């Protein structure tokens, strides 16, 4: 029989990532991989196996192209004709954290286990964080060469 995680065999860890001048797509993909926990060999899809990840400086996200004005973030409130339109520039001007939150929630699984993984992502705008008590390990995204 293959291995599956037990009740308390699951382990967590705290990682902090700076987002200054980092590409949104790469940063968010790496974060999603970390929250799902594909970095541990004890991965199992029916139970959460990832780590808590904290991102700093959500307002310093850098994106390529002219999408600062030509990319839109959409949502509809519920009434007919209630569709409203905002850009990434306005989104970072108003709530900088929303863009990173949306990007990460878009690639996590869209099931209840996925939104349960979403429960454990901390996203802030400023350079400080009140979670220094949990001594997070700084994480820098790297690529394996082959």
């Amino acid at each position: 029989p293959t291995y599956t995680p037990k009740a308390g065999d699951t382990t967590r860890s705290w990682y902090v990532i700076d987002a200054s001048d980092v590409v949104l797509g790469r940063l968010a993909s790496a974060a999603a991989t970390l929250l799902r926990g594909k970095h541990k060999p004890t991965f199992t899809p029916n139970v959460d196996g990832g780590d808590f990840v904290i991102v700093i400086n959500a307002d310093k996200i850098a994106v390529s192209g002219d999408k600062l004005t030509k990319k839109f973030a959409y949502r509809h409130s519920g009434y007919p004709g209630g569709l409203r339109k905002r850009t990434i520039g306005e989104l970072l001007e108003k709530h900088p954290t929303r863009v990173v939150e949306n990007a990460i929630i878009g690639m996590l699984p869209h099931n209840k286990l996925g939104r349960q993984i979403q429960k454990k992502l901390k996203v802030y705008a400023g350079p400080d964080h009140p979670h220094a008590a949990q001594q997070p390990i700084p994480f820098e995204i790297k690529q394996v060469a082959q």
Binding site: T2, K40, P41, T42, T44, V144, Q146
Partner: protein
């Protein structure tokens, strides 16, 4: 000779419901609603009995890729190097080792990189 129908229908209907025990609503209490989704349930069993090998292999490869990236190597490179070295161990045993002995993976990745050629983009 008239053969009035007491046990013949009863035996088969009871075996249908008994096999259909454990459902909700009319499902586990009612015959005409049992046989239909009884057959649906067993058809699902037939299909996912094949699907189970695929899903397990998927999870298996996922765990192996995780272990390889922890040991700083990609899944495709690890598998190609393993085939070049001529080791016939299968993903079941690799996954159990990844759960079990990182020393075993350390030795295995060392063997794989040793068997890896000089240049990966050679025309050979």
């Amino acid at each position: 000779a008239r053969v009035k129908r007491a046990l013949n229908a009863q035996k088969k209907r009871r075996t249908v419901l008994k096999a259909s025990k454990g459902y909700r609503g009319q499902r586990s209490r009612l015959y005409r609603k049992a046989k239909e989704q009884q057959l649906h349930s067993l058809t699902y069993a037939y299909r996912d009995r094949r699907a189970r090998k695929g899903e397990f292999r998927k999870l298996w490869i996922s765990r192996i890729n995780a272990a390889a990236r922890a040991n700083d190597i990609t899944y495709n490179r690890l598998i190609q190097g393993l085939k070049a070295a001529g080791v016939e161990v299968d993903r079941k045993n690799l996954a159990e080792l990844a759960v079990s002995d990182p020393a075993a993976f350390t030795a295995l990745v060392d063997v794989a990189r040793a068997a890896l050629p000089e240049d990966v983009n050679a025309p050979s």
